[PDB]
């Protein structure tokens, strides 16, 4: 943990070989105490993160971390949420730009392989501080099937089975590995139902059907919607009968 | 096609050893065009299977005739599929401790193999294992003059590993020549390798 | 955009962020390069955290042309930036003399935008070190880009964790008359000495290039030169 | 120092088989531990 | 420590304190109240005299970045004049191009990504204003949107933000705000500024109404005078 | 907790008359929701009473497929009452010395040596039936 | 060995794991999962105690960013 000049202060190197002000934008993931989960199944892929209403006043209906990128790619944001949404801007702006360039719906693995690389840009130069936000787009592709990408502030970024960020990214991805090494190609009723799952296992809520917020991609219709309250509703209730 | 009596061959497991054989050793016999990238898979995994079965029956004919059979696959598969086959066909043979009298001919024959491939890490454990079946044949003067070979060969890569090992077949042919004097210098430079490297349990053991 | 170097030489005549970039390498990855008479190969530790971890979707093993390929030890982001810059490096000289580029070129255009970013203002170095392997004039390359900027012609070197007795490890272990496929042998196990836990066909990237180009081994290739090993 | 803790653990392996007197073979055991294992 | 001294350095918990530090300037303001109701939206100021010197009109918290969308502020007004003016041509340029008034949502989003860049960089500074943006439409409903300096922006039904913030929003839990009109929360807005108005602390202050809504054809205009005078009656009798 | 009680007095007599009338794979997925309540509102005089029903139910039926798939799947459930199935054991065993043919007697043993292996709240049954086994 | 372990318990799972573990933690790791077969009143350690014995004693954050390798 040795520091020498401006290395905690500014995106250089530190005497070991560290980048304090990357490592920082991570601890900024947990500012917001929401933790993201995502599971990829054989035809399907679900992402869910906890929704939190403080207050009757706050429209419910705005507090959202899931955004629609495109039609058929959506991503759920965990972090800042300011710096949540530049980077689905410039996620959506990058699709478009795929598209009238290239003719083709953006992959989702290069979705984020060039958000990792706008947000490398920033642990490089030292005149902006690197994104505090944690982008997971989840979408169907052509012929690798459902697709799940992490996409950190240090510009790493991984293709997942299951994925998890926020505060409990750690207690999370233990319960998820315990399901994934069990070996099982999930339908989309069950991939949904572990995701809860893991949300409701680490947080400890018992979750309301107003609570988190589902969003699903599916190879028979490989567009990303949002899980309304009374689609919601099933699985939970499908949870509590078993 | 190949692929349906390959789960016949494994659903005959179940049943007679020696009924599954007729299975496999088909697909063994079976011709094959030019790439067939699923065909040689198969077979791969079949001749792997069908030697993997004989290791119980023991049958040598089918066995030891397999690798002077198979000479001609193994220009098809890629070259680290095929040493491993080599690898694998042999290792079955020498575990077997039944002593055919051919254990020495197809062993030699698969190290002019290696030396045709290039295999030079592969050829010096074949080698070292044919200092082993030397001994077993109360070959000591040949096991010697092999051993000599592969002691200076070892040195050089410091494979201190398979030093050890050669260095004790040198020290218990020297025994079984009555030559006790050479006998404990050879085990003395088999303790002393031993000591600069971390001896698996099996190795430390036949030390010992 | 800062405008002013933040690398500086230290009072004793040191690029001080220079050093600490190096030390980042020091800390990633093990990569191991052999230069065979026949091909060069490239190995590394491309070991996951959890199982959660698909590995296939990042590779660490990069071919840049049809005959030049990457590996390196580092930071996985500025490795990736090196990439597209080396790949457009490489259609830069492709386009206007229509023909692939060499592999000593190629290092030095990719080791000068590394240098650059220690002399340009506002900028760290690049925490990386590449290992660049290709096949010209019928001759096997390789080649280490540090961070620094230099460039070294290497018979068979290592990088990452463990490096330095991984390079004594080759220093016994390699000839010059060594061929592709006993490289790939020595390759895996300049890893092993340096992995922890076991190595399958997943946990590890091997990438070989030879007259017919660059090529990364599929997970079951590598699964049947690990078989050797043991 | 390093050659001095040869001797040392020469005599070392002197007493591992009950030995009075060092013989050559502790002496390369000895040197094979204090150099290539440490 | 001078991990506080911009806004592209984080702190060693992940946290940028310029931004926060700039969220402070906002609860040293007066406090400016919104309330979305059944059919538009009405925004309060409480809107202090420093001196009787100024005239009464003076540093209008109170905004019109379009004929639909309106603008309460509360932190510094320069900087909250010049975000106005961002908003300003953030609705000309939608009209300009895409050729209809922008919807709140959209402007809500375009400001507060304007609002974020300026909390990335050492070159500049977050922005020292909290604003509420409201609109009205047949189509898209009464809508209200508040943005920090940091550039979070969510709908609401009643908004507060200034120094008696978590005061002002306690009174607004108790309004029935999805049921009751425009006509009735000007009423109960004036009654919220000045129940959390301070008589012994910083006082003379001027009330300061705007709204939007089918009462107004969805146009944000300031309440009248009429209207705005009896319901500060109306506010000074819930007082007694 | 929720008190069960008289809710299984009247579901388990009449689940047997229609168990003698035949239904057995229906009668027994009814019992299977009643255990599924009463296990989860840890109702123990409750739980034990549909459980000692169910494998008396394919006792005298002669279901000895079913009677040993039921034994397994009911002692497997999730958070069943330690005592609850120890009632069941205890129950069963009997069935064990009452049985005279010796595949049925035997798998019947394995099968309830095998519930209750590694479980101290029945270690005093799976003792006795390592007796039984061992005499024949 | 001083356990009644089940032979369905593999301790080669816990121990290729490369968690750099003290004979106090792996001391732990057991005697963790001998109290989970206690608390299901069971006197056999079975194969899931030990799993989650070992998750409840290492208890180890990260603390590494995968971006650095």
């Known amino acids: ?175 998820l590995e315990k399901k994934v090494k069990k070996k099982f190609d999930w339908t989309f009723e069950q991939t949904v139902e572990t995701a809860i799952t893991c949300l409701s296992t680490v947080l400890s809520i018992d979750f309301k059907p107003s609570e988190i917020e589902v969003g699903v991609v599916t190879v028979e219709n490989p567009k990303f919607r949002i899980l309304t309250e009374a689609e919601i509703d099933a699985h939970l209730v499908a949870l509590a009968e078993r | 096609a190949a692929v349906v009596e390959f789960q016949r061959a494994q659903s005959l497991l179940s049943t007679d050893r020696e009924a599954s054989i007729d299975i496999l050793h088909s697909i063994v016999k079976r011709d094959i065009q030019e790439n067939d990238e699923e065909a040689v898979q198969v077979k791969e995994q079949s001749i792997l299977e069908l030697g993997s079965l004989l290791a119980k029956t023991g049958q ?82 040949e096991a010697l003059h092999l051993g000599s070979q592969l002691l200076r060969e070892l040195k050089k890569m410091d494979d201190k590993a398979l030093l050890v090992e050669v260095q004790l077949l040198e020290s218990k042919t020297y025994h079984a020549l009555s030559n006790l004097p050479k006998a404990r210098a050879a085990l003395t430079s088999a303790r002393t390798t031993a000591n600069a490297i971390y001896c698996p349990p099996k190795l430390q053991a036949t030390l010992d | 955009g800062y405008s002013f170097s933040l690398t500086t030489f230290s009072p ?86 229509q023909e692939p580029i060499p592999t000593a070129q190629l290092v030095q255009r990719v080791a000068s935008v590394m240098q650059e970013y220690t002399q340009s203002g506002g900028v760290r170095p690049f925490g990386v070190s590449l290992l660049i392997c ?31 007795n991984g390079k004594t490890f080759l220093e016994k272990r390699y000839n010059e008359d060594l061929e592709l496929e006993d490289a790939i042998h020595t390759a895996i196990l300049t890893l092993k000495e340096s992995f922890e836990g076991q190595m399958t066909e997943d946990n590890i990237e091997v990438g070989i290039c030879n007259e017919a180009g660059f090529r990364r081994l599929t997970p079951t290739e590598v699964k049947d030169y690990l078989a050797a090993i043991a | 120092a390093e050659v001095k803790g040869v001797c040392t653990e020469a005599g070392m392996y002197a007493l591992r088989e009950r030995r009075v007197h060092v013989t050559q073979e502790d002496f390369e055991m000895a040197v094979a531990k204090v150099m290539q294992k440490d | 420590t001078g991990y506080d001294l911009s806004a592209s350095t984080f702190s060693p918990d992940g946290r940028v304190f310029q931004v926060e530090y700039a969220m402070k300037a906002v609860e040293n303001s007066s406090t400016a109240i919104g309330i979305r109701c059944k059919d538009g939206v009405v925004f309060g100021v409480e809107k202090l005299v420093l001196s009787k010197l100024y005239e009464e009109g003076s540093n209008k918290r109170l905004f019109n970045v379009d004929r639909h969308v309106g603008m309460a502020v509360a932190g510094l007004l320069a900087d909250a004049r010049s975000l106005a003016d961002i908003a300003r041509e953030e609705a000309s340029n939608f009209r300009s191009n895409f050729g209809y008034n922008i919807p709140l949502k959209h402007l809500a989003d375009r400001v507060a990504m304007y609002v974020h860049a300026y909390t990335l960089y050492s070159a500049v500074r977050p922005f020292g204003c909290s604003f509420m943006l409201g609109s009205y439409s047949v189509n898209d409903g009464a809508q209200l949107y508040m943005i920090d300096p940091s550039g979070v922006s969510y709908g609401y039904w009643g908004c507060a933000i200034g120094k008696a913030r978590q005061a002002a929003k306690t009174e607004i839990e108790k309004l029935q705000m999805k049921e009751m009109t425009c006509r009735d929360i000007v009423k109960e807005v004036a009654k919220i500024i000045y129940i959390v108005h301070d008589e012994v602390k910083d006082k003379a202050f001027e009330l300061e109404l705007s709204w939007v809504g089918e009462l107004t054809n969805g146009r944000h205009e300031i309440v009248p005078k009429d209207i705005r005078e009896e319901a500060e009656k109306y506010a000074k009798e819930s007082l007694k | 907790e929720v008190d ?93 010395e009452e049985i005279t043919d010796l595949p049925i007697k035997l798998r019947l043993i394995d099968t309830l040596r095998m519930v209750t292996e590694g479980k101290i709240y029945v270690e005093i049954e799976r003792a006795r039936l390592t007796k039984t086994l061992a005499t024949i | 060995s001083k356990m009644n372990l089940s032979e369905e318990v593999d301790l080669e799972d816990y121990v290729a794991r490369p968690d750099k573990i003290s004979g106090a933690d792996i001391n732990s790791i057991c005697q963790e999962s001998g109290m989970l077969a206690v608390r299901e009143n069971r006197y056999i350690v079975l194969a899931k105690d030990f799993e989650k014995a070992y998750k409840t004693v290492i208890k180890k954050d990260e603390q590494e960013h995968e971006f650095y390798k």
Request: overall charge positive; charged content about 25%.
């Open chain 1, 1 to 175: 943990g040795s520091s020498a000049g401006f290395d905690r202060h500014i995106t250089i190197f530190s005497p070991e070989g560290r980048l304090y002000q990357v490592e920082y934008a991570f601890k900024a993931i947990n500012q917001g105490g929401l933790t993201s989960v995502a599971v990829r199944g054989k035809d399907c892929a679900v992402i869910v993160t906890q929704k939190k209403v403080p207050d009757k006043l706050l429209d419910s209906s705005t507090v959202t971390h899931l955004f629609k990128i495109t039609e058929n790619i959506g991503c759920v944001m965990t972090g800042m949420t300011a710096d949540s949404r530049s980077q689905v801007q410039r996620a959506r702006y990058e699709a478009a730009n795929w598209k009238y360039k290239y003719g083709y719906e953006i992959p989702v693995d290069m979705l984020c392989k060039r958000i990792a690389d706008i947000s490398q840009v920033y642990t490089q130069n030292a005149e902006m501080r690197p994104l505090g936000c944690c982008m997971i787009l989840i979408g169907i592709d052509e012929e690798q099937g459902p697709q799940v990408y992490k996409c950190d502030p240090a510009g790493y970024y991984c293709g997942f089975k299951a994925t998890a960020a926020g505060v409990k990214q750690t207690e999370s991805t233990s319960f």
């Open chain 2, 60 to 141: 040598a004919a089918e066995l030891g005739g397999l690798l002077k059979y198979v000479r001609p696959f193994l220009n098809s598969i890629s070259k680290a599929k095929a040493a491993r086959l080599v690898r694998s066909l042999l290792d079955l043979f020498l575990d077997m401790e039944a002593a055919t009298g051919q254990e020495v001919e197809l062993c030699l024959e698969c190290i002019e193999w290696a030396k045709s491939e290039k295999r030079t890490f592969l050829r010096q454990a074949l080698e070292a294992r044919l200092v082993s079946l030397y001994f077993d044949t109360k070959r000591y003067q």
């Open chain 3, 12 to 97: 004793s005549g040191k690029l001080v962020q220079i050093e600490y970039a190096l030390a980042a390498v020091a800390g990633g990855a093990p990569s191991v390069g052999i230069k065979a008479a026949n091909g060069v190969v490239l190995a590394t530790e491309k070991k996951q955290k959890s199982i959660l971890y698909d590995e296939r979707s990042v590779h660490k093993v990069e071919p840049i042309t049809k005959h030049i390929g990457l590996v390196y030890s580092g930071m996985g982001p500025d490795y990736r930036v090196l990439v597209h810059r080396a790949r457009k490096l490489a259609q830069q000289y492709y386009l206007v003399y």
């Open chain 3, 134 to 164: 290709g096949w010209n004039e019928g001759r096997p390359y390789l080649f280490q880009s540090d961070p620094s900027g230099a460039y070294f012609a290497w018979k068979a070197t290592a990088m990452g964790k463990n490096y330095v």
């Open chain 6, 4 to 96: 069960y009680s008289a809710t299984v007095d009247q579901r388990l007599p009449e689940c047997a008359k229609l168990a003698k009338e035949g239904r057995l794979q229906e009668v027994i997925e009814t019992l299977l929701s009643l255990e599924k309540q009463t296990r989860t509102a840890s109702d123990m005089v409750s739980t034990s009473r549909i459980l000692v029903a169910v494998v008396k139910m394919c006792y005298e039926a002669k279901e000895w497929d079913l009677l040993n798939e039921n034994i397994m799947l009911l002692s497997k459930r999730r958070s069943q009452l330690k005592q609850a199935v120890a009632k069941m054991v205890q129950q069963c065993c009997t069935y064990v």
